[PDB]
């Protein structure tokens, strides 16, 4: 489930097509990809 | 990957090599050591009386390896002087540990 957020308000859009890049509740044109749930391993070095 | 620290490869830990130009003279090559072992072994061999040359050297300062060169008189041999130095260092460390444990138990 790849979903995007709006960088102005924070409404979680769900784009799956390539129509336009725009929010619904604002009208602004900037969206971020949301970080889903997964584990990443690091060395403490 | 940070695993090649103290483990050697299929080589020996110590390799002996008795040189040909000078008699009663040898060079022990020690893997995975540095200034710590080499300096005390060198300064313990100088305390010996049938030792005329004792010296240690890293072949390159970025390698974890030393070479120890001993030249002895004819009353002893290089291998005897090496082993006598190591046994004396163990007995000195045991004496030091007993003294330190006594002082720590005294202070409380």
């Amino acid at each position: 489930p790849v979903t995007y957020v709006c960088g102005d308000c924070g409404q979680e859009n769900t784009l799956k097509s390539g129509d336009v890049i725009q929010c619904r509740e604002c009208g602004y044109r900037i969206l971020y990809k949301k970080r889903t749930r997964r584990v990443v391993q690091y060395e403490a070095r | 990957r940070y695993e090649r620290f103290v483990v050697p490869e299929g080589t020996k830990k110590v390799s002996y090599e008795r040189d040909t130009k000078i008699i009663n003279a040898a060079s022990f090559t020690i893997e995975r050591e540095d200034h710590t072992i080499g300096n005390i072994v060198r300064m313990q061999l100088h305390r010996d009386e049938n030792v005329l040359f004792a010296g240690y050297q890293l072949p390159h300062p970025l390698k974890y390896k030393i070479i120890v060169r001993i030249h002895t008189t004819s009353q002893s041999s290089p291998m005897q002087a090496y082993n006598q130095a190591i046994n004396d260092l163990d007995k000195e460390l045991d004496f030091l540990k007993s003294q330190f444990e006594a002082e720590v138990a005294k202070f409380s």
Binding site: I21, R29, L31, Y32, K33 | -
Partner: protein
């Protein structure tokens, strides 16, 4: 490592995408340094702590 992905659009109909990558670096053996008096130079050796020469407080 992917830090963010940003999707933008224009007013005349054009889409943009930006992907950002994060790296973490400690100095390696040819990185460049300088003081505040114009003495620039390159790092040529990284020495262990117990091989350094020390003062009577251990600095």
């Amino acid at each position: 490592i992917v830090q963010k992905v940003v999707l933008s659009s224009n007013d005349d109909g054009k889409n943009y995408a930006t992907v950002s990558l994060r790296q973490v670096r400690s100095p390696c053996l040819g990185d460049k340094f300088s003081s505040m008096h114009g003495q620039k130079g390159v790092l040529g050796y990284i020495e262990e702590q117990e091989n350094f020469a020390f003062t009577n407080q251990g600095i």
